[PDB]
Amino acid sequence: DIVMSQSPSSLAVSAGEKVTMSCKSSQSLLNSRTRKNYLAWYQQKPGQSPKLLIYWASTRESGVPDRFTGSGSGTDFTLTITSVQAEDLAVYYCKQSYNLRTFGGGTKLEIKRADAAPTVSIFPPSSEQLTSGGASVVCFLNNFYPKDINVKWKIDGSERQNGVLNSWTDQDSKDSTYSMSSTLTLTKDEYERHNSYTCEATHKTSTSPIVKSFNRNEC
Amino acid sequence: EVKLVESGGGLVQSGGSLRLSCATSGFTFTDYYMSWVRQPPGKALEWLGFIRNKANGYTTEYSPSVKGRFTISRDNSQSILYLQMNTLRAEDSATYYCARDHDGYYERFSYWGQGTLVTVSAAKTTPPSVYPLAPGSAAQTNSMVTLGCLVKGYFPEPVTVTWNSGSLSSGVHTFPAVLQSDLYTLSSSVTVPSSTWPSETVTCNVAHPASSTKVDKKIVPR
Ligand SMILES: [Mg+2]
Ligand SMILES: [Mg+2]
Ligand SMILES: [Mg+2]
Ligand SMILES: [Mg+2]
Numbered sequence: 001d002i003v004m005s006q007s008p009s010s011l012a013v014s015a016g017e018k019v020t021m022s023c024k025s026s027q028s029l030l031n032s033r034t035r036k037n038y039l040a041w042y043q044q045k046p047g048q049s050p051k052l053l054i055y056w057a058s059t060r061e062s063g064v065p066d067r068f069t070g071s072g073s074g075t076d077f078t079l080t081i082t083s084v085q086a087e088d089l090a091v092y093y094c095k096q097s098y099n100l101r102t103f104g105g106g107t108k109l110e111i112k113r114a115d116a117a118p119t120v121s122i123f124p125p126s127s128e129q130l131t132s133g134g135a136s137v138v139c140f141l142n143n144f145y146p147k148d149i150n151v152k153w154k155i156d157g158s159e160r161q162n163g164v165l166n167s168w169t170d171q172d173s174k175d176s177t178y179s180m181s182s183t184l185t186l187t188k189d190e191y192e193r194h195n196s197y198t199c200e201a202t203h204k205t206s207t208s209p210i211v212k213s214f215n216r217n218e219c
Numbered sequence: 220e221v222k223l224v225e226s227g228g229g230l231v232q233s234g235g236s237l238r239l240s241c242a243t244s245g246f247t248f249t250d251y252y253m254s255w256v257r258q259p260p261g262k263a264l265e266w267l268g269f270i271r272n273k274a275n276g277y278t279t280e281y282s283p284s285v286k287g288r289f290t291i292s293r294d295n296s297q298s299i300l301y302l303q304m305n306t307l308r309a310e311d312s313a314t315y316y317c318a319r320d321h322d323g324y325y326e327r328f329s330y331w332g333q334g335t336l337v338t339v340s341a342a343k344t345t346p347p348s349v350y351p352l353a354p355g356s357a358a359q360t361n362s363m364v365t366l367g368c369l370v371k372g373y374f375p376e377p378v379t380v381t382w383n384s385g386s387l388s389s390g391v392h393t394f395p396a397v398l399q400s401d402l403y404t405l406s407s408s409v410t411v412p413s414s415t416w417p418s419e420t421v422t423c424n425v426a427h428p429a430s431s432t433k434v435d436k437k438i439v440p441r
Contacts, residue, residue, distance in 0.1 A: 001283070031323065038323040042264075049316055050256075050264065052329035061329055093264055097323055099252065100280055101266040117233055121365045121408075123352040129369070137350055140408045142392060165404060167394040181394040181406045183369070214355040 002096055006104035013084050014112040015176070020080045021107040023094030027132045028074045029057075032096070038098040041070055043108075045090045045171035086111055087173045102219065107139045111176040115126065117205040118144035118179075122198075122212040125191060135185045135191035139199035139212065144178040146204065151182040153214075154198040192216070221245030223317050224364070228335030229429045230344055230375045235307055241300040241317035241332055248298040250274055251328075252320035255302045256376060258334075259313040268319050307339045338375035344415035346430040347373035349423065351438045352406070365410045366438045368423035372402045379426045380407045387411070387421070392424050416440075 003026040011019050029037045037057035052061050054070035057077055067082045081088055088110050094104040118141040125135035135154040141149060147168065153160045168180040183198065198213035227239040241253070254269040272290045279291050290303040300317050315337055317332040318409055352367025380393050388408055396405035406413035411421065417440040426433045 034324060036323055047332045049333055051331075054327070055329070056323065059326075067433060090411065095264075095266075097320075100282070101269070101320075103256075103264040103266060105263045119365075122355070123358075123367055124355045126350040126369070127353065129348070129350045129371075132348065136350075138367060138406060139335075140365060140367065140392070140406075142365070142408065142410075165397045165399065167397050167405065169392055169394055179392045179408075180393070181408070183404065183406065214357045218355060218357050 002029075002099055002102050004096055004102050004104035006047065006092055006094060006107050007219050008107060010108040010110065012110040012112050015086050016083050018080065018082050018207045019108075019109065020078050020082055022090060023072075023077045023079070023104050025077075025096055025098075027074045027098070029096050029098040036072050037038075037077070038096055039070075039072070039077050040095045040097065041068075041093060042093045042103075043088075043090045044093065045087075045173065046047065050093065057180070084109070084111065086176050089171050089173050089176070095111060101192045110171060111147050113176040115203075115205045116140055116145040116177055117203055118201055118210060120199065120201050120212045122214060124214055124216070125188075130188050130191075133188050135186045135188045136164075137186070137191075137197050137199075139182045139184075139201075140179070141182065141201050142179040143172065143175065143204055144179070144205070145177045147171070147178040148204065149180065150202045151180075152200040152202070152209070153182070154200065155194045156195070156196050157198075221332055221383070223319065224316060225332040225335040226428070228315065228337045230338050230340060230342075231304075231307055232341055233308055233339060235306045235339075236303070236368070237307065237337060239302040239304070239315055239335055239337070241302075241385065243298055243317075243319070245317070248293075248427075249295065250341070252322065253291075253293060253300045254316060254318045254320040255289075255315060256331075257313040257315045259425050261311075262313070265313075266317075284340055298374050304337070307337075309339050312339045313335060322423075336375075336377055340375065344429045345372060345374045345402060346427050346432040347371060347378055347425060347434070349425050349434045349436045351423065351436050352408075353438055353440055354441065362409050362413050364413045364416055364418065365408055368407045368425070368436060368438070369404070370396075370406065370425050371404045373404075373430070374402050375425055375429055376403055378403075378405065379428075381407075382407075382409050382425045383420070383422055384424055403415035
C-alpha cells in the first residue's frame with residue numbers, strides 16, 4: 001500500500017498568481033529500468049470527470065497549457081500553476097502507478113476576486129404545482145462574491161424559516177462568482193392565507209439587503 | 220473516437236448486488252488495462268482495482284477496501300468492461316468511473332468515462348415533478364429576463380437538466396440537489412434577453428435515469 005499525501009488541502013489566489021501543491025509517496029516511484037517516475041497529476045473541474053495533465057511526473061499531456069509544470073523524483077513531487085486562470089478552478093489529485101494505483105487526497109484550488117452583489121429574482125409558485133396542493137416560492141441569488149451570503153424570507157412582512165432549502169453552486173469558471181438558490185415550500189392553503197412574499201439577500205457588498213417580492217394578487 | 224460510457228448505476232438496497240458496465244470505442248480494447256475508480260460525493264478519488272491486458276493474461280488486482288466483494292471482468296468480444304459489486308452498503312454510494320489503463324512504460328492513455336452514480340439505499344425510486352418558473356405578473360426589471368425550472372421530489376440522484384436540448388448553455392446555473400426526508404429537489408436558472416423570451420421558445424429538459432423518465436417543460440409567460 002503506497003500512501004500518497006497531498007498538501008495543502010486547499011488554496012486560493014487571485015487570477016494570474018502562482019500556486020504549487022505537493023504530493024509525497026511512502027515509497028520511491030522511480031523505475032530503475034524505464035528511468036521514469038510513475039506519478040501523474042489530474043485536474044477535476046466541478047461536475048466533470050478527472051483529466052490527466054502531467055504523467056511521468058513532468059511530461060505534460062498533449063494540449064495541456066504550459067502554465068502547468070510538474071517536478072520531483074522519487075518520493076516528493078510538485079505541480080505548479082505559474083499563473084492561475086479562472087478556468088483552473090478545480091480539485092487536483094496526484095496518482096502513483098508504480099505498484100497498483102493510489103490517489104492522493106487532493107488539493108482544492110479556489111479563485112479570489114472583487115466582491116460582487118447578487119442579481120436577485122423571485123418566483124411565485126407555478127399554477128401546476130398549486131394543483132398538487134403544494135406551493136414553493138423560489139428565489140435565485142446569481143453571480144455574487146464572496147460565497148458567504150444570507151437569505152431571509154418574509155411572508156406578510158414577518159420572517160419565516162421553516163420549510164426553507166438553500167443550495168449553492170460551485171465557484172463559476174467564467175467569472176469566479178457564486179450563485180445560490182433558496183426555496184420556501186408551503187401548502188397551497190398556507191400560501192393562499194397570505195399575500196406578501198419577500199426574499200431578502202444581505203451580502204458583505206452592502207449593509208442594505210437586496211429585496212425582491214411580489215403580492216399574490218399583483219397585476 | 221475514444222469513448223467510455225458507464226451504465227448500470229442507480230439504486231440498490233443494502234446487502235444487495237449490482238453490476239456496472241463500461242462500453243469502450245476508438246482504440247484496441249484488447250491490449251489495454253482497464254481500471255474502476257469511485258468517488259463518494261464531495262470526496263477523494265479511490266482506485267478500486269483493474270484487469271490487465273491479454274498480453275498479460277487479463278488478470279486482476281483490487282484494493283483492500285473491496286477485498287472479496289467486487290469483481291472485474293471484460294467481455295473482450297463485446298469489448299466491454301464490467302464491475303460486479305456485492306454485499307453493498309451506504310459507504311459504497313458514489314460515482315464509479317472506468318478508465319483506460321496500461322503501465323507507464325507506454326506513453327498515451329488518459330481516458331475516463333463520465334461515470335455512473337450508485338446509491339445504496341432502501342428509499343423508493345420516485346420520478347421528479349418538473350415546474351416552470353416564470354416571472355410574476357409583477358413588473359420585472361432589465362433588458363434581460365431570468366426563467367427557472369423547479370425539479371422537485373425525486374429519488375435517487377441524479378437528474379440531468381438542459382435548456383432547449385443543450386442549445387441554451389451560456390446563462391445556465393443548475394443548483395446542486397438538496398435532500399429532504401427521502402426526496403431531492405433542485406432548480407436551474409437561465410437568463411436570456413427580454414427580446415428573445417417569450418417571443419421564442421424556452422424549454423427545460425429533465426431526465427431521471429433511475430425511473431427512466433424524461434420531461435420537457437416549456438416556459439410560458441403570464
Ligand atoms: Mg497536492
Ligand atoms: Mg486510491
Ligand atoms: Mg399562515
Ligand atoms: Mg454566469
